[PDB]
Design a protein around this ligand. Structure first.
Ligand SMILES: OC[C@H]1O[C@@H](O[C@H]2[C@H](O)[C@@H](O)[C@H](O[C@H]3[C@H](O)[C@@H](O)[C@@H](O)O[C@@H]3CO)O[C@@H]2CO)[C@H](O)[C@@H](O)[C@@H]1O
Ligand SMILES: OC[C@H]1O[C@@H](O[C@H]2[C@H](O)[C@@H](O)[C@H](O[C@H]3[C@H](O)[C@@H](O)[C@@H](O)O[C@@H]3CO)O[C@@H]2CO)[C@H](O)[C@@H](O)[C@@H]1O
Ligand SMILES: OC[C@H]1O[C@@H](O[C@H]2[C@H](O)[C@@H](O)[C@H](O[C@H]3[C@H](O)[C@@H](O)[C@@H](O)O[C@@H]3CO)O[C@@H]2CO)[C@H](O)[C@@H](O)[C@@H]1O
Ligand SMILES: [Mg+2]
Ligand SMILES: [Mg+2]
Ligand SMILES: [Mg+2]
Lengths: 331, 331, 331
């Protein structure tokens, strides 16, 4: 229940390294087990903590448990599930990040939809914030995961000018709704993303922190380089050129947010999918996490529980599939 | 004239141990003999090489030999003197470091002065770099000795936030000016310092390598512990606590620059002033150099030519005043 | 249970020649018979003493009998087994060395693990030391067998710089824990190893005796030459080149520890695996032991109880499998 006097820069260093409980509560289905992961237990989270991860990101997709508007009431039972998992992490002395994840179907960033979306978001973030209001500063809110216009040609290229405008407004309404509930929520750290959590120059240039709020942290995701990390079109990593380009991606993030804007940055998702390339994945993970540490950025590995993809921890056995990667990330 | 394909960490190991030609071309007077040292000769430098030092640091104060703006022309004769001394060392197969030394009167790190300073520095480093363009990779440039705001309370405590920002900008302009002259200067190793070459946490945290340039080496100076080394308030050295603390100062340097940032480090100045304690000075020198060698740091002893202070070599007779200290440094 | 005034040099001469009770209490299994040796009896030890061995090395692996943190309690019954075997030897007028053996899984020499490891080691050595506090100076503690980072490329090549640093710290904590229990443990001889008990130049150079404690003896193991002794890739021994090189390995040990450092040295493990080469094994054993005796080094043969490997004594029948080797060692 305690709130410290701690600037975002120092707070993000104290966050250490993080791990995502991916494809669990973020699962796009009313049943959170539908994407192949079991109901999350304390024993799973205990292992994450023991490995040395200081932050748990707890992504949550709310769509299937929001009732009809005008109220848009969140099922109390669904909040109970989120709350229990959060406590598994807080008990382990970990930071916990709770977000709005695969909810883009009702978070459409167009001027036409803005008032409707703002209204629903406002009511939803009000209810999430109210439920977690008494918690201390180890609990962090992240307003929107990768807010964007699904299906459009600019979805993954920093959006349109209109897209970026509406996303800043959606963050505005979400931050205000959280702050307005008062208590610890007046001062709680809040992670605010760029459009789609993109690092493209256009997304960076139109980024706005709501109210210049001094307790807002920047959220970007950078699966760099995407050919290796996401597409599987490249399975090799480690040449000078690989290293130089990654450093240049992280320098662009530092120069803009940290140096020029005096903000802290959480890389709330990154990692590489498995492509029969364990040596390269390890080298990439070690290098990426070290480069983030050098720049004061908190790196949070994306784990979807599937060993053939992003899974480095076996949730069923509680053994690490790729403990080397884990050990490299938390160094 | 040759430039090898050689990473900084390996280059710094090859630098071995170094010795400073202090109070010579760095002398704050139009006459470089005014601080008690003679005009430097090849025979002096031969002895430095014969003793086993592999690196000569050739500090240079340029103030008395720079013309008025807007050109800020460096006297050609002064460049000739620097060049001759450099060749004394290169002929002995030693590395040689050329810098900008006691020039803080026109290198004021304030926002107010930044544009005037950047302009002059750019023009001055352009001229130094052009004169030495054809030299091979045994010749190293160090952009700024101990850049700082003289007189301020934070001068020797890592500066102000403003101080540190202006110093990073000054390094930026200097590195760019060197690189822009092309030739061997495209790939030559450059030593870039923290504010005042300080190892204080603040100076370490705000340090930026211009452009992430991969041929930049970190420069810090650590006269550790200062009470023994500089102030003469303590003349004893060798307890467990003395050793442990020195190891901890060097570990802080390694952990930040070498491990976390993947940079090489030249300790371009360190040593102890004479305080009627030859046994302690020797033990300190042996221990400090060994600890640097074990961490891959190049140690360069500060010698001001005065046997009652930092002088371990007699420049007049070409005999060593304290050969044991020299022999302990070179391993 | 008396403590003599006896310097390490004289103590090591009095230790004579030794034999290891290998693959017994050091066995990496909850059951100490799992590696093919029976429960050790006084009648076995009587034969070791009768043959002329003056020292018994009693290696002990503790892992399977240490309870959970934070106490890390050693099973009293396991200590009783160690104690009984020790007394078998003490009753025979022998020295006995008790160690920590195949316990590298919780003694990981990295900076990351150092605090966790130091804490456990401190508590474990405190309990071993307390159990044996009243014993006289015929009982010797050896802090760590072959401490190292298992699996790494430098495991058997003297470690990394980090490896060696962490091992010196582990020895520091272990020696301090023993000394702090007081009584006879203030003055008991303690054998302190290099990294992996290696004689590689890097392991030798970074070796530190905790506190310069004057009752610490050096522990190194040198299965020289390893091609003959360990790998079985060479089965011949006895040329002048074989002899000259072995003499040079032992001179390197003498020159560093005995002459330059004024320390005593126990070669706590050496020997040769059987390679269908009895005549050569004998010649090697005779020569190696004589060369150790001439240098004041105590040689202790490694015996794993398996006649096809290092076993020269039959523990089941109490007959010697290779009495010639034993006689050559103790001569
Ligand atoms: O296999 C089960 C299920 O997977 C669904 O795809 C998931 C991926 O498994 C998951 O890795 C990915 O995670 C992304 C995360 O949600 C984003 O925030 C961002 O960080 O990028 C991550 C990596 O792409 O999410 C997708 C869903 O978008 C399939 O869609 C589904 O068919 C399948 O059953
Ligand atoms: O006695 C000659 C002259 O000395 C000046 O002091 C010199 C010191 O002799 C010299 O040791 C010192 O060196 C410093 C070096 O320049 C710095 O880069 C850093 O490494 O610290 C060194 C040790 O302090 O420099 C000073 C000059 O600042 C006197 O100022 C002068 O009055 C006197 O005539
Ligand atoms: O007996 C079968 C059992 O043996 C295990 O290997 C043992 C060797 O038998 C033993 O000789 C060897 O001894 C080493 C000693 O422990 C070290 O301190 C050092 O002095 O080197 C000695 C020579 O190697 O230890 C090994 C274990 O590390 C097998 O591992 C096991 O699979 C098998 O069942
Ligand atoms: Mg590739
Ligand atoms: Mg002192
Ligand atoms: Mg042979």
């Amino acid at each position: 229940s305690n709130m410290r006097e701690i600037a975002p820069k120092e707070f993000v260093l104290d966050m250490g390294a993080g791990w995502n409980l991916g494809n669990a509560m973020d699962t796009y289905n009313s049943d959170e087990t539908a994407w192949g992961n079991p109901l999350t237990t304390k024993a799973m989270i205990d292992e994450i903590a023991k490995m040395g991860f200081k932050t748990l990101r707890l992504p949550v997709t709310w769509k299937f448990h929001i009732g009809e508007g005008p109220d848009y009431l969140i099922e109390a039972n669904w909040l109970d599930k989120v709350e229990a998992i959060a406590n598994f992490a807080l008990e382990n002395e970990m930071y916990v990040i709770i977000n709005i994840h695969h909810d883009e179907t009702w978070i459409l960033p167009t001027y036409e939809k803005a008032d409707e979306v703002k209204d629903e978001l406002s009511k939803v973030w009000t209810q999430i914030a109210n439920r977690f209001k008494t918690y201390g500063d180890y609990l962090i809110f992240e307003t929107l995961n990768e807010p964007r216009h699904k299906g459009t040609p600019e979805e993954w290229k920093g959006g349109t000018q209109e897209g970026r405008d509406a996303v800043n407004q959606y963050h505005q309404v979400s931050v205000d709704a959280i702050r307005a509930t008062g208590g610890n929520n007046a001062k709680r750290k809040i992670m605010v993303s760029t459009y789609a959590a993109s690092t493209a120059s256009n997304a960076l240039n139109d980024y706005l922190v709501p109210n210049g709020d001094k307790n807002v942290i920047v959220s970007v995701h950078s699966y760099f380089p995407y050919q290796f990390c996401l597409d599987g079109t490249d399975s090799t990593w480690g040449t000078e050129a690989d290293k130089t380009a990654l450093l240049a991606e992280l320098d662009k993030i530092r120069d803009k947010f940290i140096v020029e804007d005096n903000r802290a940055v959480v890389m709330g998702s990154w990692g590489s999918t498995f492509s029969d390339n364990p040596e390269d994945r390890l080298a990439h993970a070690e290098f990426y996490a070290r480069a983030c540490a050098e720049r004061g950025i908190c790196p949070i590995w994306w784990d979807n529980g599937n060993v053939d993809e992003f899974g480095i921890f076996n949730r069923n056995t509680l053994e690490w599939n790729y403990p080397e990667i884990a050990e490299a990330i938390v160094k």
